């Protein structure tokens, strides 16, 4: 019943920017911290960012700190990731994740739900 629909991915030049969106349904979005996680070519899931239900406490991986901004619009059941100053190594599939534990905003777990993802490609091509 839980669904997480990611979008906004695409191809951009290094230094460019993109905004990802995640449309959530099937659960009470306003009760849950939400996460962004990613999978680069040849690697496993890397936790990227997280935000509390109320939207004013955020967490970031050192690798994206200062470049990415997570935010949420509960009235729209939507999570966002504003990505600026993109680097080649930000290339990956990006997933929206609902934690099993409602207050868990700082890390992912194998018990979490995630969407099918959205493909992000950063290159001067």
């Amino acid at each position: 019943e839980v669904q997480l629909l990611e979008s906004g991915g695409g191809l951009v030049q290094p230094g460019g920017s993109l905004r990802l969106s995640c449309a959530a349904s099937g659960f009470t979005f306003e009760e849950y911290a939400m996460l962004w996680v990613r999978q680069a070519p040849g690697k496993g899931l890397e936790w990227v960012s997280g935000i509390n239900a109320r939207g004013y406490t955020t967490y970031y991986a050192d690798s994206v700190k200062g470049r990415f901004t997570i935010s949420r619009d509960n009235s729209k059941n939507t999570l966002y990731l504003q990505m600026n100053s993109l680097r080649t190594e930000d290339t990956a599939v990006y997933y929206c994740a609902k934690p099993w534990y409602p207050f868990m905003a700082s890390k992912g777990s194998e018990f979490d739900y995630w969407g099918q993802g959205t493909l992000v490609t950063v290159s001067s091509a």
């Binding site: 839980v2 659960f27 934690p99 099993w100 534990y101 409602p102 018990f111 979490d112 739900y113």
Partner: peptide, 11 residues
């Protein structure tokens, strides 16, 4: 995952 979801709700 359903089990853990309900656990979180319970807590």
């Amino acid at each position: 995952k359903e089990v853990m979801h309900y656990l979180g709700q319970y807590i």
